[PDB]
């Protein structure tokens, strides 16, 4: 009864970062050794758990949150960081326990002429809470004047699309990001490896 990591790290499609897709993992044996030694990941930055001794320790729930971001903002995915992604699309708590994996997917998601199917949020009234998911696509009000959902001055669509095309460098190349939050609670903690 292995944990279904293949369905997470090999999904055909990945949700946009503003609507990052969350999968709960519980009641399974997780072979984190394969994930750790796969050697196909650009970054494996883990906090609060040794990336070598992660197999031994078993937290109750495993939240695998997946999305896609451009490479230069991958550093933004970390506790205490700031930026457009860390303040409007997806933020991690300061005391976040768990690990993050990010690998290039330019040969997979980029399309000739520009893959414009991936969105991200630029505008919000207030910054996100930890693990906060804001998926409302309402018009944004920059001023104090209500404009009733009509595009114009101080009315901006909060979502912008990524221009993912194969001619882009590393900075603009898409990178698939999977963050594993290791949730500990007053529970039997039925999730560890071999």
């Amino acid at each position, epitope marked *: 009864n292995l944990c279904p990591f293949g369905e997470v790290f090999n999904a055909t499609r990945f949700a946009s970062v503003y609507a990052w897709n969350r999968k709960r993992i519980s009641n399974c044996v997780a072979d984190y050794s394969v994930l750790y030694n796969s050697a196909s990941f650009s970054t494996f930055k883990c906090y609060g758990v040794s990336p070598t001794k992660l197999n031994d320790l078993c937290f109750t729930n495993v939240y695998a949150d997946s999305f896609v971001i451009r490479g230069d903002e991958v550093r933004q995915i970390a506790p205490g960081q700031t930026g*457009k992604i860390a303040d409007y699309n997806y933020k991690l708590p300061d005391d976040f326990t768990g690990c993050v994996i990010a690998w290039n997917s330019n040969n997979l998601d980029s399309k000739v002429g520009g893959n414009y199917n991936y969105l991200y949020r*630029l*505008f*919000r*009234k*207030s910054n996100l809470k930890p693990f906060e998911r804001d998926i409302s696509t309402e018009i944004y009000q*920059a*001023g*104090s*004047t209500p*404009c009733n959902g009509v595009e*114009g*001055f*101080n009315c*901006y*669509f909060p979502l*912008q699309s990524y221009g993912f095309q194969p001619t882009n460098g590393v900075g603009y190349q898409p990178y698939r990001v999977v963050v594993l939050s290791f949730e500990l609670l007053h529970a039997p903690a039925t999730v560890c490896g071999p």
Partner: antibody
Amino acid sequence: QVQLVQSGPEVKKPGTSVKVSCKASQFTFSISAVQWVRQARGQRLEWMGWIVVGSGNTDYAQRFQERVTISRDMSAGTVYMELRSLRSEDTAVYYCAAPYCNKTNCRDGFDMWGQGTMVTVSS
Amino acid sequence: IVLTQSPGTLSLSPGERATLSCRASQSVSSSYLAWYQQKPGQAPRLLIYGASRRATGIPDRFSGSASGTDFILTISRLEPEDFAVYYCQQYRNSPWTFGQGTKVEIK
């Protein structure tokens, strides 16, 4: 120093392209929208065209669509207007306007106005 | 939208009340138009936004009113520094055209 710094007066040859520069200072440039305005010496102001810096959305004039490209750069927090195929009539002042915009909210109008750039195009 | 300003030139003495009118070809929301002030020599400055609201730092003598297809700004007591040119600009429907200009000269 909330400033819209602009390049000094330019003397450009006809048929060339000039990059009119708009450097923002002391105000967050992610949320703000920048409009560009034009003024021939002694004439009125014609609205060059406006962009939203955060999302890159642009909108040009009905008569300047074919030689004007207004783009933004968050790395330096600047706005560039590319004026291609310059000609004699182009000698004018170019102004950058933008509402006072904080991290989340903006003013309901164009208040800040840069020093303006003189451009002279002739042989 | 075409914008017109009237009168073309405002021959007036300092100290009295002057009215500037702006006509929009169609009904334009009041909240999305402003008038600016330009003295030849520097950039035009914002005076009124939303067609009825006082901007920051401006003297209270300037004021704005009217609605729909007619917009008005009145200056209660005219000062020699007020003697400049005034422009309209709506920014509801693209293009955000400016007014032709409303110059005032001392009689």
